């Protein structure tokens, strides 16, 4: 895989797509592939009944976790030419939450808490690394693909850390992190904010682009004719339910790249 | 489409200053179009008497929501040349709120909470997208144009998400977000801050401009001889009432653009 | 009509340093400003009283814009303010605030940081924060009009020039539609418990040239400084910096006719 | 009377590193120079035993206030000078560790350091020019150790003609009573940040690959006209369990070249 | 010693390594070298039983403190390393470092449906050097001794160590036993070393961590010289603390490094 020069940006050598990627929340019902919930509001987080021996901090309902969202783009068909993602815009679809959250005797409720803002854009699926937040965290007993291994040994990156590729919408954001040792031909960016009551701050607009060229001036190459978008966003909780943007918008700019073959 | 800019001359330039008033929903039914409240302080958010079946978190009073504000500018006739907005300044009209908020045994009350800061500037009305914050949010039963559809399916961007254009001051800021897939010939910018007690931070001054040229050096073109200003700003709540800046100021700079016809 | 700058010479340059004092309203019977950096306590009146403190507070508990004028030496040619430094005079408040059983009290709350510099007084716009806010019954020049109609900028919005130290910062905001030949900058921070953050130093300047390279022109031979700063409250009293420092740099400008 | 810089040479350059200790007031009284406490943790702030007439918000124990720290540097003599030493750049860096276990807990609830903060340094060819101020209409300062601003506290909470001036020539100037004088301090660089609030988290960065240039608009640094450089500084991170905390030290590395003068 | 010119970037003269450095928490159990816990979650901080005399704010369990993590890199041996006039040595000229982190929500539990969060006092620190990190011994309190096992505590009276003075002990981070609450990097030393640290106080302060894969940190000094591996080794030392949750300290799952070496000429 040797990279040559960019093709002169022409009408039939350029390609643009806009798309909205929906947020994903886990599904407790068992089906045939499990179905994602496209929700921007989860079920309530709460300790189970007195008698029950399910510990919600160890095995939460799939209902109350966010998984990475997925989308694939196959640009039109074309000493070899391949599609190159050289820039993009991405923007969050978001409204302020006030009235919908209710009030306690006129004290307005608000959206706040632990947050994630993540996007990834690559010529193959996102390489991910399996982790536990706690010595006792197993994940949901349905829907989610949980990291294989003893939770007591996975709260640190070690030789037994499991690796995986985000090829379905079943990877919980609380259990899998992007693998910085892999993800070649891929740009990603993530921001985690902790705290129980941390206000989320989101900006959006329509006159701002993200360049995607590396140190050599090479963007993402679609070597198998596909671009893999993977992303996840979490704004905090409100009334014990996790909230998400209504969507993550992408506009992708492709040119053509010469590759030796 | 677009040719060269006309040499900046006295006859070929045009400037306007204006203040855009904030909009709050009106509970009284009209006689005639519904009338906006130009208020920077809403009615109190509070639950109904425990007998009542109106759920304020599902159908709030129009009284307690902010809608997008509107203004149109028609620059003077031209004796095809078209008006082009190439830069502007916009500034919030704001004072600190201290004494007016009262106190509790000398404990000074403050303005804080969930915030929005938004402006848009375009050759046509703002393209907007209909959304729900909750699986149960319907919006006010009067005044507001609410997003058509089942609230259970609108909390995520999907094939059923309704589209609209902000052509009246009846679009609640809690239900409609700018459409990033549209809004060509338009620049907008939005910031949303969550939280129930988040302090607002506003800066203002008179020596700062916003350039409005795109990647090609083209500003907003008034193809039908009009510029559409649409904006909304929310600073938080105080004593259960939402506050807004007293106004949003704009100064618009137009030159003339030669256009192939 | 503005011409070229005069070559920077010894007699064509002028510098002044000054401290501008904060202003708090005065309840007693021109009315005299209180030059205080700490106000009276905000509290409701006794139960019997018909005075509503959120509608008509004591002048005692509000900050008004501070004023200073500078007339550079006599010299056609006119004095031009082309740069300045401004800096807040400030100390951390710890012991002075007291404590509740060892829990140290702090300064926090709603803030304003504002300065303006112009060849005429600051153009200001009258506003109400509430449908019911009238302002203090003495000292302050309150915005004329029904409070129910002034919480939004409209036709009834009164205009005024800051020509005395009686303009409450809670009722008057700089007019962005006017204030030609003037730079100003303001920051407002809300919240009841918001920590103030203030930086200061002595190696930082603010340029004051506009898009044309023209600073503030003293067309009537005067420079008008107007400013106000509020750090929050402590024990129900509003605090201010001890002063706002300015150093002004003037050159000469040829103004045609 | 400033001329050109001397060509950077081995003999014409000079570097020093030093740690400046934080200063807290000392209650044990005078007769003789009072002794500073070099502490990064003060005594507890608390009201006196009920019935007492000492008001801690008006006259606190010297124990519970931070004073400006001092250090002087005299670079080596200049074989037949007039050439003078010029501080043209420096690095300064806070010596700091996160406080967790040491702060204790309340039924498993970890205590933290938070509160009102100051971060200040000054570097000059003479002592720091300072201005006397009161935070309150009733604040007198500690009845021992500290040099308190002269005047009625009711008239000192604003800068006016009654504002006393002083030079930081001892480690007895309380940070709560004296602020750098922006109308003076020629041949001096200083920088200060004040953060209010009772529970404000401090944020401190440090590293070893970052310098602060000290040249003014003319390309002139601090000139040691009497052969000395005066370092004055103070840093406060907040409180923990009613005691004020400080960095363990403020580090400086100073870079001198020589400046020719007439 | 006397640094000469960089060797022309070649295939033969370049070297890259990626590695993950594990966080370190103290170990209470006990003969040989004490074993670090590679945990991103500590034991609970709690006072002892009302009948005990161990004061947890003076001598905490090794269990509840973070120590500096260590890693060493020895790049490949150099062909024709020494000549008449000079020798070639490995020079670290840039790196990327990135935290391995996930949001903690469900794992933290809840009280009546009020979701728990990770918050509190934080440290973000990395160091990269041709020798071990020079560190300075300090006390946060006039009474803090540190854990009675595992940790190498600063020698001296705690009453005199809460300030930098002539009694301040110096040390090199040569094992994973230096508690982050007792030892700070020495700015008066650490030549041929770049380090960077951020401390955030407060009991309830939210941590904010960014990560990505298109950002590098240059490591050249004022002269254009990076870290020189004069004894053929690069020493990585680092520590990161995100706050507490349910009385236990949390850490990133790891700190990732990618190191870029070229060759540097040096007069012997």
Swiss-Prot record, chain C:
GO molecular function: structural molecule activity
Compartments where found: Virion; Host nucleus
Signal sequence extent: none
Primary location: virion
Highest taxon of source: Viruses
Keywords: Capsid protein, Disulfide bond, Host nucleus, Host-virus interaction, Late protein, T=7 icosahedral capsid protein, Viral attachment to host cell, Viral penetration into host cytoplasm, Virion, Virus endocytosis by host, Virus entry into host cell
Gene Ontology terms: biological process: endocytosis involved in viral entry into host cell; virion attachment to host cell
TM annotation in the entry: none
Cellular component, GO, one term: T=7 icosahedral viral capsid
Role description: Forms an icosahedral capsid with a T=7 symmetry and a 40 nm diameter. The capsid is composed of 72 pentamers linked to each other by disulfide bonds and associated with VP2 or VP3 proteins. Interacts with sialic acids on the cell surface to provide virion attachment to target cell. Once attached, the virion is internalized by endocytosis and traffics to the endoplasmic reticulum. Inside the endoplasmic reticulum, the protein folding machinery isomerizes VP1 interpentamer disulfide bonds, thereby triggering initial uncoating.
Binding partners and assembly: Homomultimer. The virus capsid is composed of 72 icosahedral units, each one composed of five disulfide-linked copies of VP1. Interacts with minor capsid proteins VP2 and VP3.
Family to which the UniProt record says this protein belongs: Belongs to the polyomaviruses coat protein VP1 family.
Protein name: Major capsid protein VP1
Species this protein is from: KI polyomavirus (isolate Stockholm 380)
Source organism phylogeny: Viruses, Monodnaviria, Shotokuvirae, Cossaviricota, Papovaviricetes
